[PDB]
Design a protein around this nucleic acid. Structure first.
Ligand SMILES: [Mg+2]
Ligand SMILES: [Mg+2]
Ligand SMILES: [Mg+2]
Ligand SMILES: [Mg+2]
Ligand SMILES: [Mg+2]
Ligand SMILES: [Mg+2]
Ligand SMILES: [Mg+2]
Ligand SMILES: [Mg+2]
Ligand SMILES: [Mg+2]
Ligand SMILES: [Mg+2]
Ligand SMILES: [Mg+2]
Ligand SMILES: [Mg+2]
Lengths: 107, 95, 208, 86, 137
RNA sequence: GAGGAGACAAGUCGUAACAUGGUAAGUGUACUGGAAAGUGCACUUGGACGAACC
RNA sequence: AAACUCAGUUGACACAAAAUAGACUACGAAAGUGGCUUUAACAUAUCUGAACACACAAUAGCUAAGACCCAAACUGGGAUUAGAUACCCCACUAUGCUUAGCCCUAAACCUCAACAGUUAAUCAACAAAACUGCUCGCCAGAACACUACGAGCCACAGCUUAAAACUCAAA
């Protein structure tokens, strides 16, 4: 349930001091806001610690290095899949709101 | 040693010159190196007269760490003021 | 580009076209049938169906080229391969049978393994958080890794420290050192790794 | 201080997934408002600023709840155009 | 019995055990994730100090202390010390929303110690003292 | 004599206000500072917080 | 950077402030009031009615005596800067707290007076729709001017009331 707006704003016929002071009018707009915008650092840390204690000789750090590389490839794959999945959408929702616009006036 | 730099103009007003001279005196008391540069708003002698006027207000307090020198293609003059050492101050007192 | 977007790069591979029809999945058969009606770019003058073709060596030659001197770049590449093979043969002959089993004489394998050893696993990239760029460590994709290995090899060979030493011999010596996991190129890879580890604390500055 | 320990704000990890345990604890603190309260209490929010922020948050919540109600109400009308063409 | 996120109640007869010990007897790994420093002290069930590890004590200095990596390092060091001092399972109690809050636990586990409970003891005054004034940058 | 205001009127030192004016602005009051002004406490919106979930 | 060699756990411990509830919208004339309990207690069966008196009036501030965790004008130190009498960091005082007096000001604003009534034939713009009756208060170009003078006041760098001259065609 939405918070009550009865006797909240400073208006004539409202004896009490205002409860809310909205900078913008509290009227639904015909549109919604736009969708607002590191990875795999633990494997990197493992690989780098092994390098630190081994003098950066990859021959005996092969396992950690392969894990790090595979995890980076998985990160790129995840970026691609997330992009395609992202592509209700704000555009469709704005179309729906346009179809049923808010009428704060008379007609 | 902290270096405090100032940039002045040949046609600087007397009141502003006094304000900046007070600031320079405070710096000298604090024992900083005051690099004063003067630009053309004039002759080099007249511009150096401003350095002499500023140092006049500090008879036995400040001195020229570096003497006036023409820099910026001769457009500007530059000098470095420093507090007088203990020995220099004692010599001034003896004088 | 004189080629319209409808043009596709040719696929030069004899086995691909000689593959039996029964071995083709539905998608592969669809791809072939579609290619039957697609414009194809003329085969570039660099690659052919020759069984001795090596894309890595071709790319190395291209990177070593200066001002369109493909002939000279190819000459240097073949001279380097010949020098590597001759040095390995000399070591194999001068070495006892016990280590002759391990001594490698295939210059192409030596070159591939040298570049692979030179490949850096992690690079340093400028990443910006709040308005300041920092050399944050980051994984390097495969293309970037291979390119960095090749470029480091070429630049180290091109350095002026080696005077009156021809590029064939310089590159052969450096490739052998890299194959044995030594030399300035591997040293540079280790320096990159060391700097990345030193700046490890900035990993979170990455956002992707 | 004068209460018993390990009862308040304590979660038990299941099968050793401390990440899941910490996510649950963080959800608990956020829903109870402790995270926001700590962030706001880091510096002293003067009473007028506090009142303005509270009013702004109340208006934002009213608007968001009404917009969500409208969206959920109209979501059914996202069907396929039945009278396509005419 | 079924797994319940609520901790066992002292005095209540419970079948839960860790290394043959009740919940009230497990060591406690107090973490403190300040704004720019993460401290980790592992004490016994009778508040007997066992281990300590901080981002500052781990060689990190200045801003480096207030990072997840430094917190992991401190957690690993504390876990190692506690392991050598005879600690297997721990009740983790963390008081602070600093960057090391979760990284300290991650390091404390990577160092070997298992966690059975995570406790948030961030001091939240019911007003009381007045904090310092806001920053205008 | 000196102050205050206004105007005429070109300069000197800053860039305080007008954009989130680059530290939002302002009221009351106190201290401080060539100087616009800085800061503390409370107050105002004559600012905003991007207005479904993220 | 400066600063402190103090820091963590546990236990004891305020004359400071009053998470969540509160997405409630209440109480009071306004200022104000959001921890718990109790006591006392929230004027007027007709409305308006103070520069013409009585009683209040946040914060700041003064006087004297206490408290002091924390915060904090001023001051001191670090840093930044051309400079930095600021913004950023640290320390600390007046001050915020209690008692008894003063002080009597706020963008004290919901910038929308009290009371009664209407929604009908709208309404410069914006803002918080347009009006009717009645009453008091106030206003009559800008700036000079929250000023000078006079007067009153526990106020002595103050507050309230408050002009004129010169100037302009604007504000
Ligand atoms: Mg400005
Ligand atoms: Mg400003
Ligand atoms: Mg202010
Ligand atoms: Mg100041
Ligand atoms: Mg009356
Ligand atoms: Mg009155
Ligand atoms: Mg008062
Ligand atoms: Mg005090
Ligand atoms: Mg008010
Ligand atoms: Mg006044
Ligand atoms: Mg007066
Ligand atoms: Mg008078």
């Amino acid at each position: 349930a939405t918070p009550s707006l009865r006797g909240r704003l400073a208006r004539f016929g409202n004896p009490r001091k205002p409860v809310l002071k909205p900078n913008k009018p509290l009227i639904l707009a015909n549109r919604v806001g736009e969708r607002r915008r590191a990875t795999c650092i633990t494997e990197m840390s493992v690989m780098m610690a092994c390098w630190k204690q081994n003098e950066f000789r990859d021959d005996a750090c092969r396992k950690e290095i392969q894990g790090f590389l595979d995890c980076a490839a998985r990160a790129q794959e995840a970026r691609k899949m997330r992009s395609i999945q992202e592509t209700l959408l704000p555009n469709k929702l704005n179309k729906l709101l346009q179809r049923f616009p808010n009428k704060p006036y008379l007609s | 040693t902290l270096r405090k730099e100032l940039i002045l103009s040949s046609n600087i007003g007397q009141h502003d010159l006094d304000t900046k001279t007070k600031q320079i005196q405070q710096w000298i008391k604090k024992k900083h190196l005051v690099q004063i540069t003067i630009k053309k708003g004039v002759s080099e002698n007249e511009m150096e007269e401003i350095f002499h006027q500023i140092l006049q207000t500090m008879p036995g307090i400040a001195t020229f760490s570096s003497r006036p020198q023409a820099v910026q293609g001769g457009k500007a003059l530059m000098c470095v003021l420093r507090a007088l050492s203990k020995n220099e101050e004692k010599a001034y007192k003896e004088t | 580009s004189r080629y319209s977007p409808e043009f596709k790069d040719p696929l030069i591979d004899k086995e691909y076209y000689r593959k039996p029809v029964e071995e083709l999945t539905e998608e592969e058969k669809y791809v072939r049938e579609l290619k039957k009606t697609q414009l194809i770019k003329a085969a570039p003058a660099g690659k052919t169906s020759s069984v001795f073709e090596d894309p890595v060596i071709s790319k190395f030659t291209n990177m070593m080229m200066i001002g369109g001197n493909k002939v000279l770049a190819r000459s240097l590449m073949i001279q380097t391969l010949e020098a590597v093979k001759r040095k390995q043969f000399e070591k194999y002959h001068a070495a006892s049978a016990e280590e002759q089993a391990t001594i490698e004489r295939n210059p192409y394998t030596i070159f591939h393994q040298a570049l692979k050893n030179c490949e850096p696993m992690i690079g340093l990239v400028p990443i910006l958080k709040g308005g300041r760029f920092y050399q944050v460590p980051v994984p390097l994709p495969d293309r970037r890794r291979r390119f960095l290995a090749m470029k480091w090899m070429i630049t180290e060979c091109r350095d002026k420290k080696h005077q009156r030493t021809l590029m064939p011999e310089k590159l052969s010596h450096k490739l052998l050192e890299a194959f044995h996991n030594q030399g300035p190129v591997i040293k540079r890879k280790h320096d990159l790794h060391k700097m990345a580890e030193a700046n490890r604390a900035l990993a979170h500055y990455r956002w992707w | 201080a004068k209460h018993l320990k390990f009862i308040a704000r304590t979660v038990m990890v299941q099968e050793g997934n401390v990440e899941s345990a910490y996510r649950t604890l963080n959800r608990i603190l956020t829903m109870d408002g402790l995270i926001e309260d700590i962030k706001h209490r880091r510096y002293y929010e003067k009473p007028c600023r506090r009142r303005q922020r509270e009013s702004y948050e109340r208006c934002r919540r009213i608007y968001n709840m009404e917009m969500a109600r409208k969206i959920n109400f109209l979501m059914r009308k996202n069907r396929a155009d039945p009278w396509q063409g005419c | 019995t079924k797994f319940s996120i609520y901790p066992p109640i002292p005095g209540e007869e419970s079948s839960l055990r860790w290394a043959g010990k009740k919940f009230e007897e497990i060591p406690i790994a107090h973490i403190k994730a300040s704004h720019n420093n993460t401290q980790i002290q592992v004490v016994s069930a009778s508040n007997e100090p066992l281990a300590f590890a901080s981002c500052g004590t781990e060689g990190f200095r200045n801003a480096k202390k207030g990072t997840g990596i430094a917190a992991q390092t401190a957690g690993i060091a504390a876990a190692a010390r506690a392991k050598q001092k005879g600690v297997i399972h721990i009740r983790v109690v963390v008081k602070g929303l600093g960057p090391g809050r979760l990284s300290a636990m991650h390091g404390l586990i990577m160092g070997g110690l298992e966690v059975i409970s995570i406790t948030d003891n961030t001091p939240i005054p019911h007003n009381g003292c007045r904090p310092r004034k806001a920053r205008k940058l």
